[PDB]
Amino acid sequence: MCDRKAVIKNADMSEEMQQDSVECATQALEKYNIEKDIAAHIKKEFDKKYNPTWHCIVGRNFGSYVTHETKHFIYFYLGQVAILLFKSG
Amino acid sequence: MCDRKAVIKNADMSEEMQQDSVECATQALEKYNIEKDIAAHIKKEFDKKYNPTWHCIVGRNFGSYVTHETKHFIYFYLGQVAILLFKSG
């Protein structure tokens, strides 16, 4: 109820943060099992703990562009769906 | 014949910005015709003119979640692909 592979590709954030997001993302699937819902709950949690503003996207077919402060970016596939997370401030 | 198409869904920004984004997005398709590139064009163009930070999303199957100040949020489908755009600051 926490362990999960998830492959990283656009690593750009503290190890703990990326690890927490990956693990936290896993819980999201088991708790919600929805790209939108998962991104919603996880986003708020990080904003409250680390401080806003975190942007999150999840799915498996979408092109996108966004800006973000240094060391505030992370991307990794998991649960047969691409996961994205990154704050800005 | 078609001009300024794209259907609105989450309107929340100056008419000019929303109309410019829709038209600007349309061009993007004509010049690139790729969801990924579409965001790149509209993103820098607006960030340069209106000033950052404009976030953009485009595809046909993806969950998204983000935060943004009032009077800076727009979403609309076009060219058989959903497009999203909104600045943050």
Binding site: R60, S64, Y65, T67 | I34, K36, K43, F62
Partner: peptide, 17 residues
């Protein structure tokens, strides 16, 4: 500051993968 870029495959669906 750096602009993130991506362009996501039918990992799972009718064909299944």
């Amino acid at each position: 500051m750096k602009d993130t870029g991506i362009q996501v495959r039918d990992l799972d669906g009718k064909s299944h993968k």
